[PDB]
């Protein structure tokens, strides 16, 4: 018969005010976004049991990336207590540099990130997670209305968070769907992704005793304001083996056959040895990420370009490495709020805009999670400043020039910020953040404790005196490049380049430090860096 | 297309519950093995409920255990409530069974697999098998590498062409150009629940034993993680309305009087998550009716559901094109078992993969395989039936058949297989140690049993027939007190004639099972 009996093929009784479409990164950070502002939120994601899936090495943070993690977390996101929780090496980078230009970067057991998150987004109040693809969007005068499922389900909501998904497309290399077609027919501005994995390697075929060590920092760095150190699981070295010239030669003898290991070796030396930093994919694991060999080049190089190598020569891959090309639309096509220009009710955040960190990732999720919820609300979207955090830098630039800012010119640029660092990113942003609903109680708490705390400190420093003749100033200037001819407070002394706040509350008029050492060292930074 | 630099003893394709006890076994067995898994991350993963064991079920794992394979000690580390069935009936009959952490059975599965001597796993679908003279030869991936082995273990994947429902490989066509006989399996999951959105302060729990069974011969309850309850549900008139209309619970309500309220177990998946299992409603049924069956349950009238459930279709394979070693009759060194073969039990796939395993291995290794016997092993009768039938034995069969059976017991998989499994090098040193140990407490307390005694006078056989049932007639061997119903064996070895009482609990229930059923 022709009997098409469309059974499924139906609403949804109970309707929402957002719906997230995907479960990667900013998908996570949205749906937590809406749904601890209080909204009633979905998220559809195709596979419950990839949420917390890292598509690259499994690692967090770094330069610019770790920026906007404190960023994130600052404003009530989960990613830095997920790599809190599931991070194996802690690592501050820049550490002898000065404030503007350090990062916290993390290793992470993909186990422990997957539970992390998943735990954290099925006990999220306002939050229901349906495990299904979207086939389309349902469009209504411009505005979006809800969401049509695969199996043909139907839900009513009205904002929309569009993410990652089938949609976007997706071609693996080695060597239809409704919304693509409704997006295509859009004047929205089609680009081409070109992302790469390397081959896992099989860590009982690798001889770790010729290579190199690298272990996390000790005390270990905490990603999240509101963690301390004990949460984290135990930690593990990487170790580096390096690129030589035999490796060098396999990529070039392979061209042929289609940042890669490839483009690196056309484009540099030879005597320039690429370091590949050997990242452990978890501690239940015997898998390893080499960081540095990502290829499209076919197996069988992949397996010469590996055994090649230090330490390598006996090694197995466990899973081979490929590269994958997606669809992206051109983010200057977005308000910047991440509201699409043509479909309002509909934001944009992620790899649909054509980034690929996880970071920029949940940042970018964060944001548009937080203003569909505004809309479905009826309240004007939040466009985070320049000025305010690189959060705006980065949807200002996406908005404005269609692209990221690059790495590359994040050292050079820093020295102009320094107001954006790290440390400082809840002192930017959890004051709008509790006007927005995105703060909890718990963190609201401590983020005024911790803002008074600093107030005090401050205060008392700038009014307890040694004068150059007290019982106390012989103790004072012994920590000194030259003894005192007139008083001085303990702000004066502070602001000399050989004086630490750690040094100065060790001595008589100024004890005791601070047991809140976030407040601490925020008086130091404040203190010294007025100038 | 490329060949692997290493050749292979054995290639197992497919990572199910078969593929694993495969590599396992040939792996352990010293033979050089490659898996081939299209996801290394879903290994262990469980299609149905998340639970292990069972009536024949159990009996199936603890012959796995026996010959040194994986599935008993994955559950031991994953299990979240264990109860003995049947714990009334006498033993042929008793069946342990365990709830599952679907996480926690996966990182016990992988890792495993990823410290086994031997075993390359590596991640990629196959394209088809190499065939020379009407002997396998190797594997081509879908990729293009060709991997080179003596055997191969053939158990599931794309080829098997499965597709979902709510309401082409050239290994299909090479497959299906033998006169292989091809059928369509239809399995079901339900809808999976979110536990905030059910109440379950009105409903029954169910909790495991105490103290608490152990699956593997080698194992001790400390091994088990938090133990939870299961809360139990009922279908209802309401529901039997929902599922009149709109036409697997859909199977079972209309073949059977509405005069009776099934049970729905409320199956947790795991200590760290919030998904629930309703065991008893799986369904090929559209959402509404799914959302209709779920709400119309006490308990679950606020529920949503999380992942709605679905049917798949699969090509399996008549078993009866293969031999008792579970060598397919066509190709030479090709091994059939688990779902290819029709069967959709984890502990029937587990079974059938422990033996094509060791017969793909022994292959390899230009040895003859092992064919068990109904009389041996449940795995025996299962593989004779799926040889001569094509079907295993309905569940519902095994209560009566059991009378025929009787030496077939959970608790003697050992006794029966373990110098078996040892001979085949499947049984490691540890093992055996401990199984000759075992052995031995055994001999020596029935033989310090048959020749320890007590006559009527006598000191201590005041306090012997006081405990006693009937009066104590004539003379009689310690064998005598265990021999005879209302006397077990923690009484007799407390009353000071017989009162060395055995430190070997394993051994001891052993001797009370063995005296009290000799006649």
């Given at each position: 018969?022709?009997?098409?009996p469309?059974?499924?093929?139906?609403?949804?009784?109970?309707?929402?005010?957002?719906?997230?479409?995907?479960?990667?990164?900013?998908?996570?950070?949205?749906?937590?976004?809406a749904?601890?502002?209080?909204?009633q939120?979905?998220?559809?994601?195709?596979?419950?049991?990839?949420?917390?899936?890292?598509?690259?090495?499994?690692?967090?943070?770094?330069?610019?990336?770790?920026?906007?993690?404190?960023?994130?977390?600052?404003?009530?996101?989960?990613?830095?207590?997920?790599?809190?929780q599931?991070?194996?090496?802690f690592?501050?980078?820049?550490?002898?540099?000065?404030?503007?230009?350090?990062?916290?970067?993390?290793?992470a057991?993909?186990?422990?990130?997957?539970?992390?998150?998943?735990?954290?987004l099925?006990?999220?109040?306002?939050?229901?997670?349906?495990?299904?693809?979207?086939?389309?969007?349902?469009?209504?005068?411009?505005?979006?209305?809800?969401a049509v499922?695969?199996?043909?389900?139907?839900?009513?909501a009205?904002?929309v968070?569009?993410?990652?998904?089938?949609?976007?497309?997706?071609?693996?290399?080695?060597?239809?769907?409704?919304l693509?077609?409704?997006?295509?027919?859009?004047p929205?501005?089609?680009?081409?992704?070109?992302?790469?994995?390397?081959?896992?390697?099989?860590?009982?075929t690798?001889?770790?005793?010729?290579?190199?060590?690298?272990?996390?920092?000790?005390?270990?760095?905490?990603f999240?304001?509101?963690?301390?150190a004990?949460?984290?699981?135990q930690?593990?070295?990487?170790?580096?083996?390096?690129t030589?010239?035999?490796?060098?030669?396999?990529?070039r003898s392979?061209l042929?056959r289609?940042?890669?290991?490839?483009?690196?070796?056309?484009?540099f030396?030879?005597?320039?040895?690429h370091?590949?930093?050997?990242?452990?994919?978890?501690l239940?694991?015997?898998?390893?990420?080499?960081?540095?060999?990502?290829?499209?080049?076919?197996?069988?190089?992949?397996?010469?370009?590996?055994?090649?190598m230090?330490?390598?020569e006996n090694?197995?891959?466990?899973?081979?490495?490929?590269?994958?090309?997606?669809?992206?639309?051109?983010?200057?096509?977005?308000k910047?709020?991440?509201?699409?220009?043509?479909?309002?009710?509909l934001?944009?955040?992620?790899?649909?805009?054509?980034?690929?960190?996880?970071?920029?990732?949940?940042?970018?999720?964060?944001?548009?999670?937080?203003?569909?919820?505004?809309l479905?609300?009826?309240?004007?979207?939040?466009?985070?400043?320049?000025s305010?955090?690189?959060?705006?830098?980065?949807?200002?630039?996406?908005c404005?020039?269609?692209?990221?800012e690059?790495?590359?010119?994040?050292?050079?640029?820093?020295?102009?910020?320094?107001?954006?660092?790290e440390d400082?990113a809840?002192?930017?942003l959890?004051?709008?953040?509790r006007?927005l609903?995105?703060?909890?109680?718990?963190?609201?708490?401590?983020?005024?404790?911790?803002?008074?705390?600093?107030?005090?400190?401050?205060?008392?420093?700038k009014?307890?005196?040694?004068?150059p003749?007290?019982?106390?100033?012989?103790?004072v200037?012994?920590?000194?490049?030259?003894?005192?001819?007139?008083?001085?407070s303990?702000?004066?002394?502070?602001?000399?380049?050989?004086?630490?706040?750690?040094?100065?509350?060790?001595?008589?008029?100024?004890?005791?430090?601070?047991?809140?050492?976030q407040?601490?060292?925020?008086?130091?930074?404040?203190?010294?860096?007025?100038?």
């Amino acid at each position: 018969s022709g009997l098409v009996p469309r059974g499924s093929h139906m609403f949804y009784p109970d309707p929402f005010d957002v719906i997230i479409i995907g479960g990667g990164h900013a998908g996570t950070e949205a749906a937590m976004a809406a749904a601890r502002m209080g909204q009633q939120t979905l998220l559809l994601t195709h596979n419950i049991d990839t949420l917390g899936q890292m598509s690259c090495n499994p690692a967090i943070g770094g330069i610019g990336k770790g920026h906007l993690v404190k960023e994130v977390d600052a404003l009530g996101g989960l990613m830095a207590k997920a790599i809190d929780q599931a991070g194996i090496q802690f690592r501050i980078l820049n550490a002898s540099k000065g404030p503007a230009v350090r990062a916290t970067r993390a290793q992470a057991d993909r186990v422990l990130y997957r539970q992390a998150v998943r735990t954290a987004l099925e006990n999220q109040p306002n939050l229901m997670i349906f495990q299904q693809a979207v086939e389309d969007l349902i469009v209504e005068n411009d505005r979006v209305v809800g969401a049509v499922t695969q199996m043909g389900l139907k839900f009513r909501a009205k904002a929309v968070v569009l993410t990652v998904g089938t949609f976007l497309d997706g071609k693996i290399h080695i060597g239809s769907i409704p919304l693509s077609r409704r997006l295509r027919e859009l004047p929205l501005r089609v680009g081409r992704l070109k992302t790469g994995t390397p081959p896992r390697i099989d860590a009982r075929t690798i001889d770790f005793s010729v290579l190199a060590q690298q272990h996390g920092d000790n005390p270990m760095p905490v990603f999240s304001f509101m963690g301390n150190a004990s949460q984290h699981p135990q930690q593990v070295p990487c170790y580096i083996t390096h690129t030589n010239e035999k490796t060098h030669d396999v990529i070039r003898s392979n061209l042929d056959r289609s940042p890669s290991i490839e483009d690196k070796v056309m484009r540099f030396a030879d005597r320039n040895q690429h370091q590949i930093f050997l990242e452990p994919e978890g501690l239940t694991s015997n898998e390893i990420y080499p960081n540095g060999i990502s290829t499209s080049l076919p197996f069988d190089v992949q397996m010469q370009i590996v055994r090649s190598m230090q330490g390598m020569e006996n090694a197995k891959i466990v899973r081979p490495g490929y590269a994958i090309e997606y669809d992206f639309f051109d983010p200057r096509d977005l308000k910047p709020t991440l509201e699409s220009k043509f479909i309002q009710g509909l934001f944009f955040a992620g790899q649909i805009n054509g980034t690929t960190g996880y970071e920029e990732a949940a940042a970018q999720g964060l944001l548009a999670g937080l203003n569909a919820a505004r809309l479905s609300a009826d309240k004007e979207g939040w466009a985070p400043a320049r000025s305010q955090a690189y959060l705006g830098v980065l949807v200002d630039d996406l908005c404005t020039l269609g692209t990221k800012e690059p790495y590359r010119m994040f050292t050079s640029r820093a020295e102009y910020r320094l107001m954006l660092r790290e440390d400082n990113a809840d002192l930017r942003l959890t004051e709008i953040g509790r006007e927005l609903g995105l703060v909890d109680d718990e963190r609201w708490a401590r983020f005024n404790e911790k803002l008074e705390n600093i107030e005090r400190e401050r205060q008392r420093l700038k009014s307890t005196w040694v004068t150059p003749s007290a019982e106390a100033a012989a103790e004072v200037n012994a920590h000194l490049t030259a003894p005192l001819s007139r008083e001085a407070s303990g702000e004066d002394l502070l602001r000399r380049p050989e004086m630490t706040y750690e040094k100065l509350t060790t001595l008589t008029p100024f004890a005791p430090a601070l047991t809140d050492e976030q407040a601490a060292e925020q008086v130091e930074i404040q203190v010294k860096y007025e100038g």
